[PDB]
Each structure stands twice: as C-alpha cells, then as structure tokens.
Amino acid sequence: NQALGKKAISKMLNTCYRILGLKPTVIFADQIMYTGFAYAARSGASVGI
C-alpha cells in the first residue's frame, strides 16, 4: 500500500527472505520482475521534449 519506489520493493524482498525463506523469495522476485516488465510495457511510458 505504497508507491514502491525502488526502496520499498527492496525492503519487501528483504522481509520476504527474512520471514519466509529462500525458495518463496526466489519465486517472489521472479514474479515481481515478470509483472514489472509486463506493466511497464502496458503503461507505455515515454520521454518527450
């Protein structure tokens, strides 16, 4: 429930490792990277003048 600005996501990965384990956080990181790529493509972010 935040903006997830490259610091909350790293914190969430650290908490997932410290609380759950190694396989769940590996799967979580893979899913995060998948969904980040997918929704970055969906958003269509672009830089203009």
Binding site: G21, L22, K23, V26
Partner: protein, 74 residues
C-alpha cells in the same frame, strides 16, 4: 529437478559437507553398483542424490554403515 538446495542444506547443516555427501552418493549411483532410493525422474544423478539427501534417507552416518554392511557381506 531441484532449483534450490535449501532443504538439503537444512537436513545436515554445513553447505559444505552436503557437497561431499552428494558427490559420494552420485559416484555410487553413477559408476555402478547402486540404485536410487527415490523415484528416478529422468534427471541426472546429481539432483537424484540431492533429493535423496533432502528427503532424509541419505546422510553421512547411514552411508558409512552401508559401507560397513557391504564390506562385511563380502
């Protein structure tokens, strides 16, 4: 297939001795004169030995007593 070996790490905890144990078991199952104690899923002997370690039926002590038993048999 085993993506991560954390269960094998926690079965006997060194992250270093498990390499030796799994290498010994893989040698036993690869050079011959041994069959896997866990169902074989067409994967290589390395992960078969690792899965045997993870499921708890392969460790140093029982490997040594198996060596002794086959030594006394012959």
């Amino acid at each position: 297939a085993r993506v991560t070996v954390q269960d094998a790490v926690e079965k006997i905890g060194n992250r270093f001795d498990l390499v030796l144990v799994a290498a010994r078991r893989a040698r036993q199952m690869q050079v011959g004169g041994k069959d896997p104690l866990v169902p074989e899923e067409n994967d290589k002997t390395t992960v078969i030995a690792l899965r045997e370690i993870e499921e708890g039926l392969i460790n140093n002590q029982i490997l040594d007593v198996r060596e002794r038993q086959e030594q006394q048999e012959q």
